[PDB]
Design a binder for this molecule. Structure first.
Ligand SMILES: Oc1cc(C(F)(F)F)nc2c(C(F)(F)F)cccc12
Ligand SMILES: Oc1cc(C(F)(F)F)nc2c(C(F)(F)F)cccc12
Ligand SMILES: Oc1cc(C(F)(F)F)nc2c(C(F)(F)F)cccc12
Lengths: 291, 291, 291, 291, 291, 291
């Protein structure tokens, strides 16, 4: 961005205005995962972008996953896994590992990255201040609902405390573990949890960073990619899509149906993708709205 | 900004970060005048840029002049002028006109322009809530200090009220008229007034929009333009410069010497010049710092 | 008030009590116009009376007109007028003049007068902070609704901001210009605007200073003057009254019907008329209440 | 105040302005005693005047005595008194009576009188919330310092709590009893206590209602009455005055020397004397200032 | 509590937890009377217990009676009483005595006792700040409703002010006198008043200190004492009980039916009975709940 | 605590008062470690005791270690250690493990335990919101200062944010990791960190739970145990004591010398030891004060 004429730099900065006005003082929940988490230039830029939102008076909330880091730690520890369908059964032991990795490893590096720009990030789980609870979930293998241990869905959210934390100028970085009604901590799918937090906080937008250009309807037809889609149309398309896009799309559906004005599936492999989706009309992501 | 690749749009937006962090929650006083006031694309962009600062949680304060509009109104009214040196004598009558034009005409269009983006601008003079007072000033013709009527300098500033007004999320647009100790309203040079407001409010930056590329030391040598200069060096250069740059430079000197971290002389003829000077490293303006 | 016995001075001050209790912490909107605006002893006393209300913890709001000052300025500028019925057509040019005179001249002298007693007054139009909007109005000539340019009625009122401004201890002085939904500033009849502001702010009282002893029913029978009247009775009488009293009475009707507890038509030619109408049982004005 | 012309009523109300501005938001401590306490028209008007100050956003604080009511109750109870010089010795028994009469009788009627105008008054002693402490005082009989039991001076004042109570819009009515450092409640001279409260609260004025026209220097020469006097001059005159004026004058000296801008000895036998001393230039009282 | 093993001291302190959690930040109204008022060890411990609740962030409110102290003062003053049934007729004179004794004597000693632990207590009646009003009540002699003078029931309660007073960290000590709608102060039965205050303040608990082990159903069968009872059952039992327990039980009924979660009749003759009823499972009192 | 007479239960609860008054609204920092962390009855009671302090309006802050859990995890992961003197060298790898175990395992169980009583606990490190920084420390082996990797001391503490967090009613549970000036996270000795937090927060008390009866001067003479000691005396004794007591004593010295009123070494093996040390005069711990 050196040889680029100044008057076009001015135009790029000015074209941001309408979205600065749309998001000022608003909550934006961001699911962070995929390559945007593993490559150092992309993660450093993701951190700077969170600092950006905060220094525009926007209120980012970061929800993170970390599936592959968990299995690697379990393999390091020699913890033999049990599998039903494609799912590992989350025994009390896998959870102590899951929690320890998500919160004590993955969340910490993001906190430190963001905090390179200032005293902003704060890590939390649903355990802290009872910020959210979990309810045990089942999954379905070959059409049968089946138990795979201490996994669940976000049950209820301490909306008050949480919103406090962000008015103080803080960026929570959430690791998706929370207690159930009996105090038993469960692991929650990070995508679904992000949609739940977004809905409960009255978020203006939910962004889902993924390793895709965007929602393809008839993958892999190039002509099948779409910029925008409504819940009704997307819900009908849901049984058609690949394994990896189902949770991302399900989250977008529950968020937007829950009242979040729009959810976005954006490409985490693009540097500063969040700046592109939020402050530019040129994002390759796909925007979900109600209808 | 259409055919421009997205990844370079992302970089333009990201390169803004460090200045967003420098100015967040800070007061920036802007002298608005020159062509940036008379051409409609430049004024519309100046207004949008004020909306921009506000929607980044920055606190712009706008000080405006309007010399040529005053003389035109005086000519329309058939008010014969009296002149000492190059100065019109500001009789009680010229002031009723000056005040009426500055506050009832020039300030109003800027307020309305800015307010096209939201309920932000509010017009004021030193008369309103006793926000600032004036002290009668003399000027010097042929080395003699001489009286030219009801003109003066900013005397004291109601720093408390003023800072209130901006925490409420408002953008004051100041017309440089204020009462003296006896209630007698004077007209204040808009440049000097901008430096006074900036100093009294603890402004982070003072920007002076002018009709120049920047400070030339040996005008019109092209090689004489400078990007940055300190107060000591600039003060010595002061007797050398053209008539039109003296007030702009004097303001920068008193502001920065008064503790304002930097004052900037930027080109009001560039669209969105303020966005360029604040969020980009490519401004043609000249930055003044202490030393 | 020198030779007057002290014990009767004490009684005058004490008889104020019940109205001090009725208005303490309450909004009182005052239409200021007529002779109370043009003679210097009456205007100086009107200003002191506003200072009085403020220094009793009452919240005065001042709405002003200025019809004759506008036409004089238009005549000074050689602006040829166009007239339908008795109305001047408010072209874009007449408005730049109207706004400039109302806000840059008439409002300023009242602000300065009031501010001789302290940092109280602040001038505003509906343009400032989007405090109120306008909607274009027509008038009726010979029973036909007809367009006379950029004149209108108060459309909606930023009740929140406004009420803020007065809790801060400020006395707004309103010039009746406001933007329409498209940003186009209109001139609003000061009487009607005063009733609109009073209703929107939950004012306890609306006072209309006029050049009359009070409402005469069968002018000019001396026996026809009344101290108090209800909306129903007054509405029926409306088609009967002189040209000059119609707007004053219409305002009182819409205010009191809008829920303002009482509106008052008081004589602006009496020194300190507002002190008389508010803190004394001896006013010649006429009080309007609902029924 | 019926046949009195309206324009002179207006002037009486307007002449109040400068003192409304001097006292707005300020603390005024009032010693209440003498006839102003015993005649029902004077007490009712004293109560209304406290309501007046409160409904002008002034902060009255009322300190009361009640010497004669105490002795009457002691006589009713058959409590034989012991006397040194002219002083009754305040045994533990006389105090239970003193406290009971001051706080449970005299303070209550004033509270109820004031509260006829609204929920304003609140009775207190130094015992409540530890609002002020006492220190045992001696008196001097025939030049010997002597002990007369549980009487004392205001020692320290809980300035914080107290000032709170008045910002809430309340009018404390103080009965001059307070604990010493050991919890032992003492009776405090109401005059001296009023000066102590006034000084500790940063009162703008202290008023002492007495049964005199004002301070006579050479009583009973009519020509000896004075409108104003300074501390130095008054302190020298102190040994000259009658028994009854010594405490009133001593209080004025300690208050004004303590920084209270002025103390006033006003005639409690004049209806609404406080309104006269505060809002009129015609008071017969005598004003004390420093010098 | 010296030779007692430490590990059992630890258990006593720990068993308090669940009630500390139930009452934290909650209002607890306490009727104080009986022996707990007359013996010095019991009263000193009652005071310390109020200090305890306050230093746990609990909000005690103390309502006190004082029947026997009133009659003793009336006998000291030679005030001949008039009696209908078992009731003294409360003439205007008996009230001046009643008020003076309750507020100027009985309330003061409790305030001073409590305040030995800090600046907590503050005495009040319904007269102060119009905190509550009274309505004249009749009583029934031989089945006839009859007038016995200036006695009444709590009519309405200034819930706002009151709750303020306790958030400030204060412990009000209420003497049951209040004005009626016309300003005429009445004496209110302290038991009934305590139930009214408890209901109006949303108290978590109402405690009634009495001179009984607890509610006996078939007094004096030892086997008839009960630990807990519901309103329906207790209401039916009401006509059966002794004269002294009727008001205590009536208060418990109106409180719990008014929504107060539980009312308790506890033994005022046990040192620190309130600590026992609140923080221990071993109280001899009887708890009333709805049903 | 069943057969124990009620009147002695009442005395145990009442004897707590003076310490409830000393600590109300005050910060108490607690080092938690040793057996109090490993046995389930002791940890459950430690959690309940934190809930206790919080439900008395006290502000507990919990600092925890976890040395043995770290080495066990390192052994599980097959991480070969390097040792200088008795110290493991904290390589970047040992820290990822240390942080993960302290924050993602040990801190979580305490948070969940405490949160069984309510939404109180919140886990943090110095990384979160930049709450505290670290400075690399060396240790001394055989009298030589030597480097053992990423270990350090608390450098500076974000006192503001922190104190906020506790006013909100939260109990922070601190894991002793923090960034240095360059963002490089270090592991901090939990004892020293507890003294640093206590000093920086103006804590009223610092408690150090250890596996000792208390400070023995001449261990293992039974007669050598002491209840209280001053800094000067204790500092001189420091070179004499066992390896395990040095850090506990050093922390007490720096805390009390830093202005913390008293530090306490209490026996973590006693159930509810904190309740015993704080609310009882029977603790076996040893209290440190300045002198
Ligand atoms: O909302 C406001 C607050 C303040 C305040 F001064 F109270 F901050 N001032 C305002 C003004 C003024 F600046 F002219 F006063 C004009 C319009 C709205 C205002
Ligand atoms: O609302 C109140 C506040 C305060 C406060 F002290 F908190 F300001 N004090 C009050 C009192 C007291 F002055 F006796 F305390 C008595 C009645 C009402 C009160
Ligand atoms: O509600 C909160 C406020 C603050 C605040 F720092 F704003 F006080 N911090 C919180 C934290 C943090 F301590 F990690 F920051 C974690 C969970 C909830 C918090």
């Amino acid at each position: 961005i050196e040889a680029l004429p100044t008057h076009i730099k001015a135009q790029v900065l000015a074209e941001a205005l309408p979205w600065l006005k749309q998001l000022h003082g608003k909550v934006v929940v961001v699911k962070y995962g995929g390559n945007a988490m593993t490559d150092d230039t992309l993660r450093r830029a993701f951190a700077a972008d969170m600092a950006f939102l905060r220094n525009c008076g926007i209120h980012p909330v970061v929800v993170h996953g970390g599936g592959p880091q968990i299995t690697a730690m379990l393999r390091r520890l020699g913890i033999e896994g049990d599998f039903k369908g494609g799912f590992r059964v989350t025994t009390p032991e896998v959870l102590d590992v899951a929690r320890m990795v998500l919160f004590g490893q993955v969340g910490r590096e993001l906190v430190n990255l963001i905090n390179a720009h200032g005293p902003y990030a704060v890590g939390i789980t649903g355990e802290d201040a009872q910020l959210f609870t979990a309810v045990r979930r089942s999954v379905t293998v070959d059409g049968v609902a089946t138990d795979i241990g201490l996994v669940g869905d976000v049950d209820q959210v301490n909306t008050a405390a949480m919103l406090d934390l962000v008015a103080a100028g803080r960026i929570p970085v959430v690791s998706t573990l929370a207690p159930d009604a009996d105090g038993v901590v469960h692991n929650i799918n990070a995508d679904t949890a992000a949609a739940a937090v977004a809905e409960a906080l009255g978020a203006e937008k939910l962004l889902m960073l993924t390793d895709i250009d965007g929602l393809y309807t008839r993958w892999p037809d190039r002509d099948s990619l779409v910029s925008e889609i409504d819940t009704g149309t997307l819900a009908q398309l849901l049984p058609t899509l690949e394994s990896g896009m189902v949770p991302k799309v399900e989250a977008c559906l529950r968020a937007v149906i829950g009242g979040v004005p729009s959810a976005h599936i954006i490409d985490g492999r693009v540097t500063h993708c969040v700046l592109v989706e939020l402050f530019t009309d040129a994002g390759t992501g796909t925007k979900v709205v109600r209808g």
